[PDB]
């Protein structure tokens, strides 16, 4: 029964071309959330409708400790809004831009949580995520991973079924996508490898500012391995960043189970990962529920048929 009126709007957390995300507080409960607000007209013009419905379904249907939980979806005459758990710790992109690299143990911890979430999306939800990156991996108040931004997900991908859409983020695109081949859920383990590489090496495995020359590096060159990198981390990166998805770690029928087995993750206990019993290597140091020191200044420092009805977009979680 939810409208813009049910919340106060406190701090802007994010704003790209389609919309914005604001830290809000729900008047009836005193609870704090992040609200992504989309203008319907802009979504229709920019061709983001099908992406928005995907994100709505993926959020509604997913229940996992490392996926942003959805509380409400609701619309007005001009807006679509998702009200989701607030991730108080900001983007991994934030942290890694300031610290340069994570220790192997810190990277291992985030990697395990990411693998847990991805395995659930693939196995339980028949979903391929497709846009894994540092920017869309957030940390909650305890320092656990929250995946956000489900708009580029593919639905209904069961086992090794394939897909065709050229989408993602250029710096993270797997070779098989660039080859204009049909591609499977192993694209998400390439993403994982790029994320893990950045975490432990402090740069992207393939880099050129220009998307086109970058693509050439991805298809043509072998990754470099800084001499500080341990033998397990080396082998994990080399397996996840195999260019042929059939040869990639996680690329077979076992999917995530093959990565979980890998010696880099030895003595990660996967059931404790899921049950959130592992000790986060970093706890966000917030004063209040509204402290946004882990978000970018550009945004937080800011003061707060063409428009169709979306059938049954509305949703409310419960027990």
């Amino acid at each position: 029964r939810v409208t813009m009126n049910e919340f106060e709007y406190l701090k802007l957390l994010g704003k790209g071309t389609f919309g914005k995300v604001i830290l809000v507080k729900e008047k009836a409960t005193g609870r704090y959330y992040a609200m992504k607000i989309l203008k319907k007209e802009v979504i229709v013009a920019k061709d983001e409708v099908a992406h928005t419905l995907t994100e709505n379904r993926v959020l509604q249907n997913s229940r996992h400790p490392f996926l942003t939980a959805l509380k409400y979806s609701f619309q007005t005459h001009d807006r679509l809004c998702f009200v989701m758990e607030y991730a108080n710790g900001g983007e991994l992109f934030f942290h890694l831009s300031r610290e340069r690299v994570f220790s192997e143990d810190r990277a291992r911890f985030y990697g395990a949580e990411i693998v847990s979430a991805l395995d659930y999306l693939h196995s339980e939800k028949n979903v391929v995520y497709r846009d894994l990156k540092l920017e869309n991996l957030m940390l909650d108040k305890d320092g656990h991973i929250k995946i956000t931004d489900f708009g580029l997900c593919k639905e209904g991908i069961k086992d090794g079924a394939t897909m065709k859409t050229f989408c993602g983020t250029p710096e993270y695109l797997a070779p098989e996508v660039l080859e204009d081949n049909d591609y499977g859920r192993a694209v998400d383990w390439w993403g994982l490898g790029v994320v893990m590489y950045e975490m432990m090496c402090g740069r992207l495995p393939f880099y050129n500012q220009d998307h086109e020359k970058l693509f050439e590096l991805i298809l043509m060159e072998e990754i470099r391995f800084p001499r500080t990198l341990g033998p397990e981390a080396k082998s994990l990166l080399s397996g996840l960043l195999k260019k042929d998805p059939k040869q990639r770690l996680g690329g077979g029928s076992e999917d995530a189970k093959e990565i979980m087995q890998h010696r880099f993750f030895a003595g990660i206990v996967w059931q404790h990962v899921y049950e959130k019993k592992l000790s986060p290597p970093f706890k966000p140091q917030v004063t209040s529920e509204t402290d946004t020191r882990y978000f970018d200044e550009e945004f937080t420092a800011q003061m707060i048929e063409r428009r169709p009805h979306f059938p049954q977009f509305d949703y409310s979680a419960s027990s």
Partner: peptide, 10 residues
Amino acid sequence: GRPRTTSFAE
């Protein structure tokens, strides 16, 4: 300390 990337779909 790389620049922020941009997601796309064609």
